[PDB]
Amino acid sequence: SFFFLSFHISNLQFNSSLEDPSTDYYQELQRDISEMFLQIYKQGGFLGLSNIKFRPG
Amino acid sequence: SVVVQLTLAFREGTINVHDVETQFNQYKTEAASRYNLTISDVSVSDVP
């Protein structure tokens, strides 16, 4: 099964780097968030997550 | 703020949408303390 999840990161400013998935900052944040999710969900059946979409909030 | 959107994948029979949401909301404290991410406004949907 699949679950769509949206949330805000309330302590980070959206900036021009986060509009561009090829930037170092975009990739670092996507990596670090992905790693966090692999810590949150430890179920044997948890496979992982998609690539991440960032938008201004 | 930064809005973050993603999809999670589990094998059949593992979890439901409420559990996904509760487990994420319960992690807010650790997300802030360990990852320095202040997580808010969580929304979770089943994707058919």
Curated annotation (Swiss-Prot), chain A:
Glycans are attached at N15. It is found in: Apical cell membrane. Expressed on the apical surface of epithelial cells, especially of airway passages, breast and uterus. Also expressed in activated and unactivated T-cells. Overexpressed in epithelial tumors, such as breast or ovarian cancer and also in non-epithelial tumor cells. Isoform Y is expressed in tumor cells only. It is linked to MUC1/CA 15-3 is used as a serological clinical marker of breast cancer to monitor response to breast cancer treatment and disease recurrence. Decreased levels over time may be indicative of a positive response to treatment. Conversely, increased levels may indicate disease progression. At an early stage disease, only 21% of patients exhibit high MUC1/CA 15-3 levels, that is why CA 15-3 is not a useful screening test. Most antibodies target the highly immunodominant core peptide domain of 20 amino acid (APDTRPAPGSTAPPAHGVTS) tandem repeats. Some antibodies recognize glycosylated epitopes. Tubulointerstitial kidney disease, autosomal dominant 2: A form of autosomal dominant tubulointerstitial kidney disease, a genetically heterogeneous disorder characterized by slowly progressive loss of kidney function, bland urinary sediment, hyperuricemia, absent or mildly increased albuminuria, lack of severe hypertension during the early stages, and normal or small kidneys on ultrasound. The name KL-6 was originally that of a murine monoclonal antibody reacting with pulmonary adenocarcinoma cell lines and pulmonary epithelial cells. This antibody recognizes a sialylated carbohydrate chain on MUC1. The alpha subunit forms a tight, non-covalent heterodimeric complex with the proteolytically-released beta-subunit. Interaction, via the tandem repeat region, with domain 1 of ICAM1 is implicated in cell migration and metastases. Isoform 1 binds directly the SH2 domain of GRB2, and forms a MUC1/GRB2/SOS1 complex involved in RAS signaling. The cytoplasmic tail (MUC1CT) interacts with several proteins such as SRC, CTNNB1 and ERBs. Interaction with the SH2 domain of CSK decreases interaction with GSK3B. Interacts with CTNNB1/beta-catenin and JUP/gamma-catenin and promotes cell adhesion. The alpha subunit has cell adhesive properties. Can act both as an adhesion and an anti-adhesion protein. May provide a protective layer on epithelial cells against bacterial and enzyme attack. The beta subunit contains a C-terminal domain which is involved in cell signaling, through phosphorylations and protein-protein interactions. Modulates signaling in ERK, SRC and NF-kappa-B pathways. In activated T-cells, influences directly or indirectly the Ras/MAPK pathway. Promotes tumor progression. Regulates TP53-mediated transcription and determines cell fate in the genotoxic stress response. Binds, together with KLF4, the PE21 promoter element of TP53 and represses TP53 activity. This is Mucin-1. It comes from Homo sapiens (Human). The chain holds residues 1041 to 1097 of 1255 of the full protein.
